Structure formats: structure tokens, C-alpha cells
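Q: What does the assembly look like in three dimensions?
Context provided by user:
Components: four
Sequences:
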Amino acid sequence: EIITLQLGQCGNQIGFEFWKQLCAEHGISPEGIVEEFATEGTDRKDVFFYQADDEHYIPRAVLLDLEPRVIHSILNSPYAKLYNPENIYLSEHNNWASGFSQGEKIHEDIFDIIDREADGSDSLEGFVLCHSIAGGTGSGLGSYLLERLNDRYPKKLVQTYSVFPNQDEMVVVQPYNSLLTLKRLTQNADCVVLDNTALNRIATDSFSQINQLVSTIMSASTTTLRYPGYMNNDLIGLIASLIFLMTGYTPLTTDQSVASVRKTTVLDVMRRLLQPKNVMVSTNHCYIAILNIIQGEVDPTQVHKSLQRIRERKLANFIPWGPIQVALSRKSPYLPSAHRVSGLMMANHTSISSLFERTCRQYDKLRKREAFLEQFRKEDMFKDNFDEMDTSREIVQQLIDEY
Amino acid sequence: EIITLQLGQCGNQIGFEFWKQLCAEHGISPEGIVEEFATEGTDRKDVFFYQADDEHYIPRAVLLDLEPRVIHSILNSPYAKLYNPENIYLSEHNNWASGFSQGEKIHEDIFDIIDREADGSDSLEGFVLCHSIAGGTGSGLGSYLLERLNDRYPKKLVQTYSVFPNQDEMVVVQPYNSLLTLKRLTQNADCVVLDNTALNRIATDSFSQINQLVSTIMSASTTTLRYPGYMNNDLIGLIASLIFLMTGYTPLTTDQSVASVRKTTVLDVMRRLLQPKNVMVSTNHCYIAILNIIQGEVDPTQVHKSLQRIRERKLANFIPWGPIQVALSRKSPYLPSAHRVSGLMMANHTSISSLFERTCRQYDKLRKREAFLEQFRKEDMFKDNFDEMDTSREIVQQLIDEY
Amino acid sequence: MRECISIHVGQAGVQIGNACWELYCLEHGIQPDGQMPDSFNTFFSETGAGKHVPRAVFVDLEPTVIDEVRTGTYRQLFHPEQLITGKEDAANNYARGHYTIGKEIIDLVLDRIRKLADQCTGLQGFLVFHSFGGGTGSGFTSLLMERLSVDYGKKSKLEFSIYPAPQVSTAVVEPYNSILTTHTTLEHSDCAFMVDNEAIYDICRRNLDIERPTYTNLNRLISQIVSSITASLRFDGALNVDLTDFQTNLVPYPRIHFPLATYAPVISAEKAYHEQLSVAEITNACFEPANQMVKCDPRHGKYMACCLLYRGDVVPKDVNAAIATIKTKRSIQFVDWCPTGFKVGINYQPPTVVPGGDLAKVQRAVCMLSNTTAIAEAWARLDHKFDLMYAKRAFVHWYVGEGMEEGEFSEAREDMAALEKDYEEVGVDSV
Amino acid sequence: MRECISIHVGQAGVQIGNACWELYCLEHGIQPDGQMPDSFNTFFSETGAGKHVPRAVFVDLEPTVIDEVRTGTYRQLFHPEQLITGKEDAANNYARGHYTIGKEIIDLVLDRIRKLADQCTGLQGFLVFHSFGGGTGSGFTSLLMERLSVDYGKKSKLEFSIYPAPQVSTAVVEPYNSILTTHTTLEHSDCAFMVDNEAIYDICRRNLDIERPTYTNLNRLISQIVSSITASLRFDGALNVDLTDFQTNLVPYPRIHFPLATYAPVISAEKAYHEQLSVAEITNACFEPANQMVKCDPRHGKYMACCLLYRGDVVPKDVNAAIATIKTKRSIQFVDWCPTGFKVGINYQPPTVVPGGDLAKVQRAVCMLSNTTAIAEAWARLDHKFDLMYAKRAFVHWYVGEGMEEGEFSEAREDMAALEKDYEEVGVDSV
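A: Here is the predicted structure of the complete assembly.
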């Protein structure tokens, strides 16, 4: 089992479309009813859903937000009735310090909800977090929740889908929020970086479609856990096989781009997952780990041949000081198999360091002139000084040095 | 297996009608579907096509062009959906120097496409190039691609169908482009000369029909490779048996000229392939090599008798310092066999030298007065000097001397 | 839940409020009597029946404009007690509106604002509409802002002010009132979205083909700007932006808080028919120096923060591509201490066309709030005019004989000099 | 994708643009209101609905011709902002159109052209329609071309200019304007397709049986030439030719870039009925010295480059046979340094007959752009007239008292002498 903590407008939407994808996959009706064709289903549902006496299924989700508008719109959607009104929380009434201050203020009810959800699962495995690191809501609230959660639950995993601000496109106060959120991520987060720049780049070459792609990534990541097989039957198995990450998915094709039914082997897919173009995020930098989850018919002989050929062709580079993985799953029996075989890749690669070097460069490009610090001084945390900022910057520098 | 690189308007069309002929021969539907009557086919398809999971077949073709209009029209044809949109490339926005400069500029994506196509074939044998040597696009782009390909892939064949400018009919800057393209062809090309003058002469005695004939020549050249038999089961076998070339095809008859169903032996065909009239291109000059591929029913006794009689009649002349070949194939089981037996001839003959002597004479007729060099000086390659031109001219002179 | 109170002071503020509330009623489907034949909650309150009372006060020291409101088509929309009016105006005198005439009304205004705040659940902040060169638009605005800071010392206070134009002017004592207001409110304000009548006149002539626009068209354009600003509170969008977001992303230092408003799809019906206004086109129009609604050339200074508020059929990828194109431009230069100078908001509601207006119906629009050092030149002009008039000591007796001292004149001028110095300092590159 | 912008300057340019855009609307099926009851993309833009706005500007310093456009049958086709007009024309004065009156309009024209270029994706180049012996057709054309070279320093700039006729003339100061324009634009142009009113009058009389043609028939013939030139961009053919193809194949040296336009099937209805116009016939008509649309006898000089643009039911083999026949001719002589002097373009779209025109409906047509040394005689005549008028110093005060100097007159004359020397040098055979 698992819980999802989505914050800010970004996280709220991310959750909306993630649950849309999930209910599509598992044959869950918009109202929580189960379709007749899926009555005898074999798919495991406990992982993301828990059924109710009324036979309806409820997501293990909690909605958090500093503002009402987004969630109010969500509850006007056809999927509104699905969520649990008890879990959803809205502030009665864009800065990280303010977000953390509110988090300190509204500890009690949030952790009440979290405890209630936790006690309903026998074998909870970890946490899932969806948020944006730039905006005031996501950054600060996620920081506070991560801190108090790592404190509260020292034996549960914490996974996040953190969305990073666009850089080629010029939050004016993004450097501070990003740097602080990164501090908290290093200091508490167990383990999926995301950026609007490269994401929209691949989308080209509304937020609805972008986050549909993101939800696709999340669902494909959690597929095998959802669909038990032989190997990789747990999230901890995933994490151990890799341990910051980046992702790529081959069949990112429009509903109109099915006309080119290209004979898609496993070799061509796994190859495509390697190119920098498909890496959805934007010094002979090299890899640390690679995982490829493959959906559809697959012959392990083909997998071995592809691995052999790629190894000989040396299209990849590895650390000199240490000695990939190809897991196979099964598609949901419901969504059309427009793709003969499909592939998702999650990897750890040193080049990601550059991200922080940019943000650090951004942050250093402001701290020398004290820009937009007036609001921060208002909050208690930065009321006296900003040693928090210095510690966070040095922590990020240490991480970059370690990479 | 094989790849096709077609450049410029000439090459783009050439490819269009070549693939039209291929799909007609192999019973491939315009959309890439396979007809019911051809389900159990024995013809080999991997050579020019690779099938897809959707059961459709995709050509191993790449479209290149400095201008969009031609390919845009192609994609409005009934055959549009057949091609691979990924491979097709169009410049976002008539000189050789400009073409080569762009080639230097757009190296990365072109070779990305080429590598992707190459890695999908186990036993790639060589390359096929279709282009015109006069226009700015074909000449320069083919030059650049040939250079960087011979550099990249030192173990693959490079075959071209180069179209030469009309001379009896007065590209004003054709001499420069032709001379440079010839330099590159000698310096990198493994092995089919083509001219509009004699081609249209034989056509008489639109570009659609001319290039239909050209595609006929190409397909008849590749027949036996497409249709495996006993001998000549590889392109390298072809090249070794001959090694500049010229071509001729006997049954070049209109769809209206089938009324004269002339009893067509093998002897009469192979004889007809010898005359200068049928040579589609325009000092006791003699031959170097002759190959005759014969389609339809054929008795090797007839072939031996024809060879004996022609040898006795001494209708041909050979080199005094060195010691032909008649290969047989099978027609596709689909296209009507309006011809009882048909013949295609590819030969190497010394007279082709004259071509260059004309172009050299053309080029020398301009370099003495510095005509239309203003645009060339613009590009980096000819920004400082034109030593490239001098080296190319001397190389062509050396080739003529060698002949 | 995210209720916000709009305060309209003076004739300019009251007329802009007329346009703004006409636009709000049209957008939310509210009839001009408050009845409808949620989204309409940050700006309207429901009283039992379908009656929707706007969450605003109309305060002036002159009965004329407020009485026009009281007898117009919207006579039954506003609460009669929230249309506060005086008896004698401030007569273009800051001292009258701040010390002598404004002190007899400020208590009533504060009581009404307290009633409105109590009626709210979560108060986002205040929207103060006023003019810089008016009596009650300057003195009473400064007094009210200081009293609100005393009372609501934490809620954001955004003010929409009509900055005096470089050349055209309707009053002779505008520099005095403008400098004194800048002093007093700069002490107690969060950010001030600025606009010029001359610039909107030029925009109307060039884009809307109107050769004889009135204050009505200017007010309609300003109301469109305000609607674009508050759409995130009033509607649902991909990227929501609150008032605190404006305050945080547009104000780098406490004193440098004077962004300039812009609106891209200002176009007539026929021209809109002949164009294909897209995200890139409207963004480029926003950054065009001729489309600024404050008559300051942005090329004379450096941007420090931009807030692009898109609305309607807008795709985030197109917005990102347009912003990248803007950043790659060389005419548009930013300060070196703001590597990220773009706050982006996207709303799903296309702008609503007012029946009888000049703006054509469009599928998407963008409002750009830009904080730039080009406003320093306008400040320099204003303080130069103040220096001339004060050196001759003209009109000073009117201010002094009304509860003010010449020491306040000197202090306000020194504060404006300090503000100019601050703009100069933030303009320079870091070394 | 291959969008191109056409610029029409002066009365001649604007009226030729009227004819050209009438022809384009007829060819692409676009109604004169922009609606249709792709191919129409290099010259038109789609705005949401079926409205197709032409990708052109109509600039003049005189309101008369542009106002005729604004109120004609095509009143709703052109964008109202792209019909740029002044208040007082240049009065056949180069200085007025280039220095005094043209400087008050060039910024607006450049802004509109920038808007059009931004609306495009890939800009092939510009088509400038103007007259050599006009005020704004010379001075403003030269100014605009130099500003475009400053801005778009890489896009091709092809200009369709009405060269002054050898004998007939409507203005007295034509040599001055022509020499100064040749100077300034020769600095900053790619190739100039030339045409004469006298030659088109002769063509109309001899071929079309019209004894009293107006400027309308001349403009229709010129529009047919332009349509034949741009057919490759607008339609699909066997051999496509772009603007850069024209520039490369027709300009051997940077200064010698003045080809002459020709159109073979200029024929009336009855004569077209009695003839069997074929590829060979139209090619021979193109190379006939009496069918040239510039009154220069080609037999007096040597061809250096020819661009045969066939369209309609044309077979490449027939074109090759006709070109071989032309090359075998002895009256038609080429320079010795161009052994290959034929650029061939073939289009599948037959020319469209304008309802009300004089050209008959034909199955095929050819437009021949020929760069030849026979234009050297026309240049010699023009500079001889300039030399006479300047030796007497007539009309020079009009130019000088308008922002010009006599030094510019001398420099322009010296540049024209250098151009004549260049033509003489390229004429001679290599030894």
C-alpha cells in the first residue's frame, strides 16, 4: 500500500490526472463503481485504492492547498464524487517562508488525516509526494510535511515527483524556494526530478496534456507493483536497484499519431530510452544506474540480445569505480494495446548535477544584492536572520561536490 | 538490406516513383497493408522494406531537401502514409557551396536518422543515393553526405544514381556543381550515370514518365537481390563483376505499345542491349565490362548460342590488355508478363570519358573569366580561395587520363 | 473564501470602479440589480436570495460622482451604506483630503470596511483605485492606507493609481499631490500598479481606431486589466496567482514597488478578424514599448520582474516558448540580479467583451505587470516639476493654510530623492 | 512555410499590386472579401475563419491611389493597417521620397513589414513593385531597400521595376530619379526584373489587337509575369524554382542584376483559336526580339542567363527540344563564359484568365527572365539624358533644396559610368 501527498496547484492537478489514469487502467468507474466486464478482475487494487462497503473504491489520496479554486474545480468534475471529502483539506482563507509557517500552524489536522489513512492499511510501504518546488504553496508545505513525516514515521519510504521551474523561460522568487526544497529533499527524501522546459520540449517535438504525460510516467513506474509478477514485487526492490533520478517513456504518442504502427521490438525501445532527447528533463559525466520496465509481449532472448548489442556498441558510459536492469511487466487487460511492446526508463546520471549548479548560480546571483527578502523577513523563521539559507546553500554545494 | 538517400527535387521524385514501382512489384498496398492474394508471398521484402507491428511495411528511405514544396506534395499523395514521418527531414527555412555549408550545419540530425535506420538491420550491405549533380541542393548535400559517410562507415557500399545536366539544351552554374560532385564521387563513391538528354531522346523516339523509366532501371537492377536465386545473390557480387557505368533496358514500351507482341527471344534482347541507341546516356573507345540481367523464361542453351553468335559477329570491342556476364532472374508473380523475355544491361565503357571532357571544357570555359563566383565567395568554404576547385579539376583530369 | 475588498477613492477611482463592476457583473452573469437569471464570492456576497452585493466601497468627498452611481443603471447593485460621500471635495488639495476634509469621513469609511471584513472569512487584501493628482485621490487615499496599515497590518494592499502623464495634465498642482501621496503611501503600501491617461489615449488611437476616446474607454481598458489580474481568484486556471503572489514576485525591495500595467489584445473588431492573435503575438505585443499603458519607454531601463497573466485558450508550452523568445531578445534587458524575472499565471476564462465597448472578442489575452527602472525617469520628471513649483513656492499657501507645514513639503521631496537614488542603485550591475 | 512578402510602392506599384492580387485571388479561388466558397500560404495568411489576408503592404506618399484601393471591390481583402499612405507625395522628386517625405513614413512601413515577417515562419524574401521614374517609386524604394538590407540582411530582395521607356515618357525629371535609384538600390538589391510601358504597348497592339490600351492591360500582363514567376511557390510542378534560384541563376556578378521579363502566349481569343501554341512555339516567341517587354533589341547584345518558367500542360522533353533549337540558332548569341545559360522551371498550373481581360485561355505558358548585355544600351541612353540635364543643371535646385547635394548627383553618375564599364567588360569574349 501507499499514500499520495499532493500540494499546490501543480500537485493537485498531477493527482487529478494520475487518478484518472489509474481508474482508466483498473476499470474503476468515475463514481467509484466497478464495471461489469471488470467484475472478475485479477489486478491488485489495494495498492492505490481501498474498497468501501458500498462496493465503491476510494483513493489513498489527500488534497492540500493554500487556495480553494483548484480543488473546487476538481469537485465540479465528473470524478468529483470519487475522492474522500474527509481527507480533502482547504485553507479557510507565493512564498516558501509563509508556506512553512502555515505548515507549523496546521500540523494537527493534516497529521490527523494522515494517521487515519495510515491505520487503514496493513502493509503500507512508503509515501508518494507530488508538488512543484517553485511556487510558495508546494515548496514550503512539502518541506514542512517531509520534515515532520521523516520525524514521525522513521520506517516508511518517501518518494516524490518534484517539478522544477523552467529556466530558458525566465516564480520571480523561485531560487529561494527551489534551494530550500532541495535542502529538505536531500536531508529527508528517500528518493523523480521533473522540469517544464524539457517536458514541453518533448511534448512539442495545455497543462492537461503535460500532466497527462507525467501521470503516464508515474503509472508506468508503479505498474509492476500494481500488477504482481515474479521479480520486483515491491517499491523497496525498485529503490535498492538504483540508489536523484530522471525518466523517459518511449510510446509518448498522441491519440492521432497511431497511424504509424511501427514494428516495435524490445531492442529498439530499450535503445530509444537511452538518448538524451527522450530524457524528459533538460567533466565526462556518466551514469549511475539504469532501469527499463517493459510492457507487452517480451522474449528474454530478445532482451539478452539487445543488452549484448548495446554493451558492445558502448552507447552508454558508466562509473569507473563500480560495476543495468531490465524488468518486465504485463499491460492492463483493458486499455487498447496500440503498442506491440512499450518501454519506460528511470535512471540516475551524474549530469543532473548541472540543474543545481544553475539554481545555485541563480541564487548566488541574488543573495549578493538582497532581492525580494522583504516578505521573508515577515515570517518568524526568517524574522531574525537567514542562516537557514546559508546552510541550505552549503548543503547543496556539498551534494554537487559529492556528485 | 540497404538504405536510400535521395536529395534535391530530382532525388525526392526519383524516390517517390522508385518506391511506387517497388510496392507495385511486391504487392504492397499504398497504405503499407499487404493484399490478400500476396499473403503467402515468397518474395524477400527485408531488402527494401521492414515490416511493422501493425503488419504494415516501411521503406528504408530518408527524405532530404532544402525546400518543403516537393515533399509536401508527396505527403498529399495516396502513398503519403507509407513513408516514415520520423525519417523525413525538411529544412525549416541553387549553389553547391551553400549546400555543403548547410550540410556542415545540419550534420547531427541527419546522422541521427541514418544511425537509427542502420541499427534496425542485421546485414546491411551498402547505400543507395539518388540525386542530381547540377542543382544546388543535390550536388552539395550529396557531396557532404558522401564525405561524412565514407568517413563514418568504412565497410559499406555506396551506390548512386547521379543525374547529369542536359548539354544540347543550354543550371547556369552547372559546371561548378557538376565538377565538384564528380570530385567527391571519384574520391568516395563505391559505384550509375544518368543524363536528361539521351533519356528524353529515348523517351521520345513529364518528369513523371522520365523518372518512371529511371525507377524501372533501378528496380530491374536490384531484382535478383530482391528475388534470391542461385548466382549473384548480393550487391557486392554485382560490383565485383564489373569494377562509372551506363545502362539500357529493352522493354521500354508504353502502355499503349503492347499491341506489337513481337516474339522476343533472349538473343534479340541481349543484342538490343548493345546498341548505342539503347544506352540511355548520351580514340577507338571500347568496353570494360558488360552485365545482362534477363527476366522471364530462359534456356541457358539459348544464352550460350546468343553469346557464341555475338562473339563471332564481333559487334563489340574489348580492352586489348584484359580478358561479359549474363545473369538470369525471375519476374515478380504479380505484374503482367506482357513481355515473353526482357533484358537489362549495365556496362562500363571508356566512351563515358567524353562526358567529363565536355564538363571540363564547360568549366574551363568559365574559370578563365570568373563568372558567377560572387555567391560562392559568400560561403565559408570558398571565402578565402578556390583551391577546392583547382584540386577537383585536376582530379577529374587525372581520371580522364586514366581512362 | 479568498474574499478581497476593492476601495474606490475620488472621481477617477469611482468611475474606474463603475467600469470594473460593470465588467464583473457581465463576467459572472449578475444582472445590474444584483440578481442572477463560488466564482462570484471573492468579489460578491449573497444575501439570502439571489441578491449579490459587491464587496466594495465607493468613497468620495464630493456628492456628484457618487450620486451619479446612486441613480445610474447600477442603482440597486451597491449597498446604499457602502457608497460613502462627503459634502465639499478636496479641491485638488492634498491637505484638504488628508487633514481637513478627510478627517471628517475616515471614521465612516473605516467602519464600513470593518463591516465588509467581518462579513468575509479569509481576507486576501485590498484593491485601492485612485488618482495621483487629485485632492481626495491623494490625501484621502494616503490617510486611508495608513489607517488600514494600522488596523490590517498584515493584509496585502494593492493600489491601482493613475500616474500623472508626462505631457497632458488636467490640474496645475498635480506634482505636489503626487509627491506627497508617494511619500505617505510608499510608507504603507505593498505594490502600486500604475497607468497613464496619455498612454491609454495613444493605445486607443493606434490600436482601437478611436480618434476621440473619452474617460469611458480608458476605464474599460483599466477594468480589463483589473479583471485579468483578479481572474485567478474569480476563476479556475492551470497556474493560479494570488495577491500575495503579485506582492512577492513584483517587489524586490520595499520601496521599489511601482510596476506598470499592460494589456496585449487591444484590437478592434475588423483588425481582430484579420489577425490570428496567438500566445507569441500577444506576448510580443506586451513587450512592445508602444503598447505600454504608462508613457515610459522600457528601453531606457531594465526589467526587474514581469508578471504575465494569460487567460483563455492558452497552452503552457506556447507560453514557455514565447517567454524564451522574449528572453533571447536583445532589446529587452533585465537586471543582472534577477536571472528569473517571470511570474506566469494562466486562467481558463477568456476575457468578457462589454456590450458597447471597443475591444473585440478574443480567444486569449495577457496582462503584463512589469517592474522596471524606466519609471525612474517619470519620477525624475515629477520631482523636477515639484522642484520648480516649490522653488517659486507657488500654491504652497493653499496647502499650508489647511493643516500642513512646509516641512512636510521638504520631507516629501527628500523622500522622493531617496527613492530616485534607490532606483539608480538597483539599476546598476553587480560587480 | 515558404512565405514571401510583396511590397508595392508608388502609384505604379500600387496599381500593379491591384492587378497582381486580383490575379492571385482568382487563381486561389479567394473571393474579393477574403473568404473562400497550402497553395494559398506563401502569399495569404488565414485568420481563424476563412478570411485570407494577403501578405503584402501598399505604401504610397499620396492618399489617392491607396484610397482607391480602400474603397474598391477589394476594400475588405487587405488589412487596413497594411495600406500605408502619406499626405503629400514626392512630386517626381527623389529627394522628397528619400530624405524629406520618406523619412516620416519609413518607420511605419518597417513596423508593418516586421509584423508580417513575424507572422511568417520561413521568409523567402521580398517582392518590391515600383517605378524608376517616380518620386516615391525611386526615393522611398531606395530608402526602404536599404533599411531592409540593414534589417533582413540575408533574405532575397527581388524588385519589379518599370524601367523608363526609350521614347515615350510621362515625366521630365525621369533620368535624375532613375540614375539615383539605380545607384542606391544597386548597392542593396539582388535582382531587378525590368519592364517598359512602351514595349508592353507595342506587344498589346501587335498581339492582342488592342489599339487603345490603358494602364490596366499593362498591369494585367505584368501580373501574369509575376504569377508565372511565383507559381513554383504557389503550386506544384515538375521543376520547382525558388526566389534564391532566380538570384543564383540570373545574376553572374553583383552589379549586373537587371534581367528582362517576357511572356510568350500573349494572344487574343480568335488568334488563340486559330493557333496551336506549343512549347516550341512559345519558346520561339519568347526569344523573338519583338516580344520583349523591355524595348531593347536582344540582337544588340549577348545573353548571359535565361530563366524559362513554363506552366501548364508542358512536357520536359518538349522543353529540352525547344531549348536545343534555341541554342542551335545563330541570331541568339550567348556570352562565351556561360556554356549553360538556361534555368528551367515547369509548373503544373496553367495560367488563369482574368474575367474581363484580353489574354485568351491557353493550355501552357512560359515567362522568360533574360539577363543580357542589351540593357547596356538603355543604360547609355539614360545616362546620356542625365548628362544633358545635369550639364545644364536643370531641375537640380528642386533636388538640392530637399536634403540632397550635387555631390550625390556626381557620385550617382560616376556609379552609372562604372556600371556601363562593367557591362562592357562582361560583354567581351575571353581570350
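Follow-up: The longest strand of chain C covers residues 122-131.
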